[PDB]
Design a protein around this ligand. Sequence first.
Ligand code: F6P
Ligand code: F6P
Ligand code: F6P
Ligand code: F6P
Ligand code: ZN
Ligand code: ZN
Ligand code: ZN
Ligand code: ZN
Ligand code: ZN
Ligand code: ZN
Ligand code: ZN
Ligand code: ZN
Lengths: 326, 326, 326, 326
Amino acid sequence: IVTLTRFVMEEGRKARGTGEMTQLLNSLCTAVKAISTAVRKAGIAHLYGIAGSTNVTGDQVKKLDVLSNDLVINVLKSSFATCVLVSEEDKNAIIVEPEKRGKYVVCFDPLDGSSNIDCLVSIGTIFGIYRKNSTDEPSEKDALQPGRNLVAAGYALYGSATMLVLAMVNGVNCFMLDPAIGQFILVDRDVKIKKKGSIYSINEGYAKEFDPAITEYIQRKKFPPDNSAPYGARYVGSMVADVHRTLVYGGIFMYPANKKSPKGKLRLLYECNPMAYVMEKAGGLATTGKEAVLDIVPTDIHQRAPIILGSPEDVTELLEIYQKHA
Amino acid sequence: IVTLTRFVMEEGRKARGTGEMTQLLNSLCTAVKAISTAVRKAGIAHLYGIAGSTNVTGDQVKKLDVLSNDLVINVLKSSFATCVLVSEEDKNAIIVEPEKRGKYVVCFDPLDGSSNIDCLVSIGTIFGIYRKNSTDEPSEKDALQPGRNLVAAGYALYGSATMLVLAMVNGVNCFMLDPAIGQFILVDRDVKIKKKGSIYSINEGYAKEFDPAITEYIQRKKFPPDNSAPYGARYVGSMVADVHRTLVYGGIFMYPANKKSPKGKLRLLYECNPMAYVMEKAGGLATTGKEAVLDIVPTDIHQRAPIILGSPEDVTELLEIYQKHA
Amino acid sequence: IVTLTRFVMEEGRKARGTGEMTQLLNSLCTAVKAISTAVRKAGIAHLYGIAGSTNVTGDQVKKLDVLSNDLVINVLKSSFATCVLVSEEDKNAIIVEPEKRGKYVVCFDPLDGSSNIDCLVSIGTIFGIYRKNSTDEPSEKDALQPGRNLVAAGYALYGSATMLVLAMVNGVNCFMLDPAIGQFILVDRDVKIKKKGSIYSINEGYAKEFDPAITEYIQRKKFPPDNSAPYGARYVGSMVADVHRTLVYGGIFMYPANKKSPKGKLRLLYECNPMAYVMEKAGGLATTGKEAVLDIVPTDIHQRAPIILGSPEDVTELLEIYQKHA
Amino acid sequence: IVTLTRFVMEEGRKARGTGEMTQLLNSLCTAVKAISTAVRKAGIAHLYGIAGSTNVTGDQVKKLDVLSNDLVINVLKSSFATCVLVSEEDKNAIIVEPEKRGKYVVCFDPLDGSSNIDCLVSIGTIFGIYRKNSTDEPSEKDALQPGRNLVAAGYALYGSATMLVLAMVNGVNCFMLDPAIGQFILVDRDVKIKKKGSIYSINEGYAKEFDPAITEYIQRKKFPPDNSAPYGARYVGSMVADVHRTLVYGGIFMYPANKKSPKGKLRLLYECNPMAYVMEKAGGLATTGKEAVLDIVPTDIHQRAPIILGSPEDVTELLEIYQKHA
Ligand SMILES: O=P(O)(O)OC[C@H]1O[C@](O)(CO)[C@@H](O)[C@@H]1O
Ligand SMILES: O=P(O)(O)OC[C@H]1O[C@](O)(CO)[C@@H](O)[C@@H]1O
Ligand SMILES: O=P(O)(O)OC[C@H]1O[C@](O)(CO)[C@@H](O)[C@@H]1O
Ligand SMILES: O=P(O)(O)OC[C@H]1O[C@](O)(CO)[C@@H](O)[C@@H]1O
Ligand SMILES: [Zn+2]
Ligand SMILES: [Zn+2]
Ligand SMILES: [Zn+2]
Ligand SMILES: [Zn+2]
Ligand SMILES: [Zn+2]
Ligand SMILES: [Zn+2]
Ligand SMILES: [Zn+2]
Ligand SMILES: [Zn+2]
């Protein structure tokens, strides 16, 4: 019934927009349609393997990884709606050549879950969008706002299906890519997380590194003091994959700070913030254990943050723990 | 270059076959092409949710689950190459009406990873093929052979891509579904597992239930006595998804017997055996901790078995443990 | 490189639009993507045959015919950019419910070449767009403008490929539907017809009915007085199919008035006008033999007109004839 | 329900075959799936234009033209079922390297309707299959049998849909390519032509060249002596396109010998014969005006023949004429 496109134009309808969210969100979707198409044949298309570079916070790039990044860069650029761009894959913020400038700052991870791709696990793209608040001719700093300054954010999941999750001030709506007519059709609106979940999602290979709170927490899920059944475990390795399952089934997802990394592994700008925004607009929470992610004022574009997101009841149970040990 | 179809005809070429493996494997592939197509649009196609029944060893069925089962049943039937069929989803072995009979017994899980489908995690189909050894007019018992009596087995993965993994006496070759021309094109031959892995794959939500061996083992991966780095964890929830990653990256996958279930959860006939066969033909191992899976003589079609499969070095490390506690 | 969508937004960029051409043209394209998808499987989709009705100027409807009509009606409606709609398939002009009204009047033949569909010949969709010029609350009459009052017009060809031909004041640009990513990509801009052609395109089954001018003309192509080689003949039966070939190869297309029908067979509003507009914006001509089609002021929405369009040199040769006999 | 593949295996079922028709017909279909995929995006895929060569009886080649030819050559080769191949596009018969030899001689036009492709008119592939009758180690001459020596023949139509028409001793069955699952599904069996048609299909641009019979005939369709309505005309320019329409709607198709070319334009081996075979197995006729096409014993592989095929009532009306003038 309702295409993605219709939905934004209608929303913008009564928000009395000028509509350059619309071009922008429309310029994104095609990329999403392009990334995904390639991914589904990434094997015959000889894309699995590596290009040859280390990402800014130290990851090994793959041909795909560049492909989608360029593409997204290009379509945002030509959308006429963005002035500053931040990407997984570039040292430095991209500024947009004035003829094409717009009021928008789009942070993004073009293809997250790098590990997963050879083993054909689900992969996704992540974005977050802010309004420039500045008189100042546009600069890198226009990206350094807290997550609470988002006007729109979500992600694409190239799983068993392709899906576009979008969060906007009004709430969360999922669309699913129809491969046949290549159009994003709306499958769930306006989504909400369970108050409490049955699943826990973390890499326990760092058991030796976790702090006492995470350690106590994880053990509470395996040995419930109430004697209820213990949460199931699930950890795919693709953040977008897990977030999503957390989102639809409820429960928790944790990429906590370990001993090794003061602030966790996941990038604040284009990974942690978007997912938190969604989570909060779905009615869940997103904490580091100490602060709301959404409130952190970034200083480095490429900066990391520990992240705990999920059904609030669960996210609180932990916070409570962290507080107990504070 | 080489279609799936070419590959089997060529293999059968020098094996001096009559060729009804070929029809049979060809009658499978289309189903695989049909299951997958549907899965990628399972949302617009209103397939997510439930039909209304409990599978034989107690699972909740979904519309999809039936769809693919019928389809596979139908295409095997019409292949002219099979006499007895065993399915996840039927109490009783299917016998084939004589005009359509063949020398083949095909066990199979039409769509495994039931949980995953709503959250768009990877899903797959699993099969194993035996030759009837019997004068006797065909019966259910023709399925009760050990796994070592397999002539062919593998699985389909509807992940970020669609992939057909096939194991035959000669070894393991992966094909990848080209969505465009709808043909299974060959991506890896003839595959082999690492002697040793870096990843561990189990549901630790049953920590309280595991036996001491699994318990000691899991802890060895988190706290290496050698002081090496601890294995990463990964558990998607779809056996085919994990097996595959284990297969391509190496490491271990465990669905061990717990306190609750004497023999684990995974069905011997159409889940455990195929994956073991592949694993062994890839050069890995597949144990219960006490016996080779391949050697177990089944008595109940629908029977379960604990299963530990993977890079041999890892699979042995555990066996050694289990032996220590024997 | 350039999507259809980009192209219109850019054009509208410097035309200083409000942009509701854009939604409108974007709301069209999806239909085009939807009509076409269905057509390519119209056989397995059991769409070939008939629904059960006679179109306003006396044609037999087919399930498809309705399908695409509804769809186009729906997407234009929801575009927010149109007040009055005229369709092959409705007695009466459609007015749009005010909340959804726009400044646009779109005439259209949802699926032309009805005959062709069972035999899998090329089929197409045709449209023309006018601006309402009226204070008056919108009515049927808003459609009765001459063709010269068009702001945009073109057609879709579901041939061996799918193609979107668009004519706008600035000229003619062809896009081709990429089945893979389902996006209209630009293949030719900004198109032009040969001054003179080598092909003639008419139904000679009405030889007995044609007027002396057409009769003399057709014979001149078969027996050139200059002793040059005689034009090749080509007549597919789908106007959009022939127009297009005329457009790319050059030459002439004729659906002249016969003895039987004072004014030919082809509908002025949503067949003759669009094709003339394109033809003129491609630099060709479009005559009845007596008047420019573009200048005819219509009185009946569903009214017909004889039409002769093509490379001008050829279109003139005829006019000259018609004049000689005037 | 029934895939193409099922259908041949079943037919071969009771014909007590060894089954290498089956591989062969299966090795064809994929090509058909490959040719077609490319054609639908021949524009974005930059395939429209020319490679640079003149075909054996004097046609200008295009990149596509080679592409599909190679492909078909390759898949037939690897089918293991063919010893001698004849193609539009090669001076000389192809012999097959013994390891891959089969009992089959396949004549074929890889992509017919060359003209049409830029204007996106329908295009097709044409084939005919004979059994080698020779002790003699295989040579070019194995192709020089009359059309009556065909075991199987038909064509592919990349029209608005993709369609596989197949004629076998038993009759005519049409399958239609499902783009989605990329499988040839059966749409009509076992087809038959009208005893009499309402349409005539010829290039009247050669009016000046036609013989008196064709001339009188064409005029009879425009001026019926019975005073019935005159046949409609239709001529697309792609033989496969017209044949097909003739096949489904009935009527006549003519590529008669003209003054200029003693024997017409269409190649006997891989154009005229297949279409005649189909026509006769559909219950229609296929004449030169003097002889059955099927009975002509060829001497040159690349040789042409005039061809008149269609509903028999119509095809006879003409013969009668030709006889009257004999
Ligand atoms: O394997 P690890 O250490 O758990 O990290 C994987 C994480 O990294 C990412 O691939 C991005 O770095 C996430 O999608 C995923 O959660
Ligand atoms: O959630 P659990 O208890 O780990 O079980 C999930 C397992 O069950 C299956 O869905 C089949 O039962 C496997 O694919 C998967 O490994
Ligand atoms: O078969 P006829 O009489 O030439 O009419 C066919 C014409 O009618 C249409 O199908 C629309 O009526 C045109 O596309 C086509 O040119
Ligand atoms: O344009 P002409 O001279 O009628 O020839 C076109 C004929 O040639 C072919 O393209 C093959 O030569 C046929 O498909 C078609 O009927
Ligand atoms: Zn990334
Ligand atoms: Zn990432
Ligand atoms: Zn199952
Ligand atoms: Zn299962
Ligand atoms: Zn119409
Ligand atoms: Zn029409
Ligand atoms: Zn050809
Ligand atoms: Zn040809």
